[PDB]
Amino acid sequence: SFHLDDINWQPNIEGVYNSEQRFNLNDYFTSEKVPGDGNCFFYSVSFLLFESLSEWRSIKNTIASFAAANWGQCVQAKLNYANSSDYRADMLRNYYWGGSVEAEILSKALNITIILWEADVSENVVTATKYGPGLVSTALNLKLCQGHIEPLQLMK
């Protein structure tokens, strides 16, 4: 649109919002490069919270604590795993690929909003999914492109 914070988000009853808006990410966001291994979701979240990659494992620990105490709120994780114990053992391993399951949990665990912007190779939004009630400008904006996750920041 004209302002990212004026996008129209459509919630489902699970509290996940979707947006059909289609624009080019790089007209509104600066991208940042993180190393392209299987930890990139966690590198990206760490970059946006701390301006450093070094906190990526502790973000996993925060997710794990939420999954242990609040498994019934881990809606997407419950589709993929029989119990919180199985989930935590898998997610905590190196090169576990983060995605919507972790975005949903982290948004609740840290009281932040996380947006997964699925992009094609030319950086056009294909799907946008927002976890949490907040606005684009306050969210952790993640670009999902060609199997890798990179942090985005609002331009200027």
Author numbering: 3 to 158
Publication passage describing the model:
One specific mechanism used by nairoviruses is the production of a deubiquitinating enzyme, termed the vOTU, that disrupts the innate immune response. Interestingly, the nairoviral L segment also encodes a viral homologue of the ovarian tumor protease (OTU) at the N-terminus. Instead, the vOTU’s primary function appears to be the reversal of post-translational modifications by ubiquitin (Ub) and the Ub-like protein interferon stimulated gene product 15 (ISG15).
The vOTUs from DGKV, QYBV, and TAGV readily crystallized and were solved to 1.62 Å, 1.65 Å, and 2.05 Å, respectively. DGKV vOTU, consistent with its low Ub-AMC activity, possesses very low activity for the di-Ub FRET substrates, regardless of the linkage. In DGKV vOTU, aspartate is replaced by a glutamate that alters the spatial dynamics of the catalytic triad, possibly contributing to a less rigid structure that allows the histidine to adopt the alternate conformation. While atypical for the vOTUs, it does not appear to be the cause of DGKV’s low DUB activity, as mutating the glutamate to an aspartate only further diminished activity. In DGKV vOTU, Trp73 packs with the methylene group of Ser86 on one side and the aliphatic portion of Lys80’s side chain on the other. Lys80 itself is stabilized in this permissive conformation by hydrogen bond pairing with the carbonyl of Gly74. In DGKV vOTU, Gln78 within the selectivity helix is central to the interaction, pairing with both Ser102 and Tyr133 by hydrogen bonding. In contrast, the DGKV and QYBV vOTUs possess more polar residues, including asparagine, glutamate, and threonine for DGKV and glutamine and lysine in QYBV. This suggests that some vOTUs lacking any outright DUB activity may have evolved to a degree that prevents the generation of this activity through simple changes to better accommodate Leu8 in Ub.
